[PDB]
């Protein structure tokens, strides 16, 4: 990166000014190296302005640690930075590098952190069985209804279908009537809400 900066410095040197090449080239080499550090030194990339904020926070915290003898609390750092304390806390927690999954846990040496990380995206088999049971119960309840109401509810909720449907295309079935489809859906819900045919589905709440 310093070599690239040096080439850029050679591209724009001016010997008429009388200064020597090191004087001008040092600035460009420094800039190239430090921009490269700002852009490529972290697994999660931090923008350059936040990198400067973090570095100057570290410098101020080190000067205050020398000054008072104990770690500077966030409000004192905020007052010295002329920035809000919430911004200080933001900068503080976004300035931590990711931990390795090969790091041992506790005092062990054959243990690794990655061996203790769950898969939170998985679905519990109890939940899958409950979903299958709910599907079966809903099918049985729908079987106790008039075929028109069962089909209307199926289209309006997407049961056994790829997509859900609004009142317009449900009306498009036989009679394109939003107010009618709405009434028959209400009737179907009222009959399904009767305690005679709802004790099976009540257990799933």
């Amino acid at each position: 990166e310093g070599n690239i900066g040096l080439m850029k410095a050679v591209d724009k040197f001016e010997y008429r000014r009388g200064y020597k090449f090191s004087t001008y080239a040092t600035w460009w080499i420094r800039q190239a190296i430090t921009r490269s550090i700002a852009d490529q030194a972290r697994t999660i990339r931090i923008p350059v302005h936040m990198i400067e904020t973090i570095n100057k926070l570290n410098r101020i915290s080190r000067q205050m640690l020398q000054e008072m003898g104990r770690e500077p609390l966030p409000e004192e750092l905020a007052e010295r930075m002329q920035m809000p304390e919430d911004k200080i806390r933001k900068v503080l927690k976004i300035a931590k590098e990711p931990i390795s999954m090969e790091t041992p846990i506790g005092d062990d040496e054959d243990s690794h952190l990655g061996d203790f990380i769950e898969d939170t995206t998985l679905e519990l088999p109890l939940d899958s069985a409950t979903a299958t049971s709910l599907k079966a119960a809903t099918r049985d309840v729908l079987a106790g209804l008039t075929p028109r109401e069962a089909k209307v509810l199926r289209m309006r909720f997407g049961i056994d279908m790829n997509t859900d449907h609004t009142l317009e295309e449900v009306g498009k079935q036989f009679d394109v009537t939003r107010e009618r489809i709405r009434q028959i859906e209400a009737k179907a819900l009222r009959k399904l809400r009767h305690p005679s045919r709802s004790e099976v589905l009540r257990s799933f709440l």
Partner: protein, 336 residues
């Protein structure tokens, strides 16, 4: 379902066929939104959505749009487990030698090319030239030239010969080999040989050559031009409690490879002095070697924890490797 497992070399076309996209940036996730960055090591356009049946846009966000690629983002509406199966690729700016086929003794490249490993490393490390196309000249293929000698004979002959230096030279030497001709030559020389040492050498090399002919593999596939990239969910970057993140070392190794490749491309675009370009090519080779097998070439690359990074060879091998820890024995349910 399947009756056998077949192993062999991977061609650049095969590696491209495995890939669902090209990783162009070393970016992983945004530092505020924690969303994958485009063309990065965790791109959803390459490896798949981060939520089931959603796109990074949030526009297509149900099963009604399954299999539809969002025009704003490019993320396919499918499941998230596809991020455990979808691979990517990196188009290397310069060819890189594969460390297993170079330093796992005996060296396959050296055995095939009948040149000592030290000479091969000298050509690779940009210390010595080698003749690729001798032309109408007394020069022979595989003969080493120093920079002084190369300049001398470049003035002497000109464009009659081609001499190269690096992994491109080894790839050109391996691509120009006539395998059936070599097999016939070793058979003829074995017919009229008496020494048992030379007999052993020619029988080993003949076995390698006829194995290459029979397998359909090409020798130049031992030099990498396209580098495969593992699925992100096998090298996860997952949040811990308190905002901390746990990552795999493969992300560090891949980021090093991508950064050095991009710097090589930028140096070649700037028409840099040859010393800088040679340095960058050495560093690219070192980074790829560290990614594949850390510690085989030399000093093992270490992370911030001052310990060597774990590479793919370490993933698959050893007492703590995948074969013995997870395949020949497992943790089981319904146990106490």
């Amino acid at each position: 379902e399947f009756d056998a497992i077949k192993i062999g070399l991977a061609s650049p076309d095969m590696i491209r066929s495995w890939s669902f996209g090209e990783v162009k940036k070393p970016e992983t996730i945004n530092y505020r939104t924690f969303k994958p960055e485009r063309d990065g090591l965790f791109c959803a356009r390459i490896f798949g959505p981060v939520k089931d049946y959603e796109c990074l846009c949030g526009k297509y966000k149900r099963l009604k749009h399954r299999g539809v690629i969002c025009e704003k983002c490019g993320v396919e509406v499918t499941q998230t487990k596809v991020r455990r199966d979808r691979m990517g690729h990196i188009e290397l700016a310069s060819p890189v030698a594969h460390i297993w086929f170079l330093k796992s003794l005996p060296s396959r490249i050296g055995l095939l090319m009948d040149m000592p490993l030290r000479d091969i490393e000298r050509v690779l490390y940009f210390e010595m030239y080698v003749v690729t196309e001798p032309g109408m000249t007394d020069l022979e293929r595989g003969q080493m030239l120093t920079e002084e000698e190369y300049l001398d004979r470049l003035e002497e002959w000109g464009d009659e010969f081609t001499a190269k230096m690096g992994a491109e030279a080894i790839k050109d030497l391996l691509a120009s080999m006539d395998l059936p001709a070599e097999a016939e030559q070793m058979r003829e020389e074995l017919d009229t040989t008496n020494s048992e040492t030379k007999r052993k050498k020619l029988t080993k090399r003949l076995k390698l050559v006829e194995a290459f002919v029979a397998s359909g593999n090409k020798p130049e596939w031992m030099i990498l031009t396209v580098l495969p990239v593992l699925p992100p969910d096998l090298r996860p970057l997952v949040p811990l409690d308190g905002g901390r993140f746990a990552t795999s070392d493969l992300n560090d190794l891949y980021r090093r490879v991508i950064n050095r490749n991009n710097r090589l491309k930028r140096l070649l675009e700037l028409a840099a002095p040859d010393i800088i370009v040679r340095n960058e090519k050495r560093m690219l080779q070192e980074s790829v070697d560290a990614l594949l097998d850390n510690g085989r070439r030399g000093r093992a690359i270490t992370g911030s924890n001052k310990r060597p990074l774990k590479s793919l060879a370490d993933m698959i091998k050893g007492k703590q490797g995948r074969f013995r820890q997870n395949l020949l024995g497992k943790r089981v349910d319904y146990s106490g």
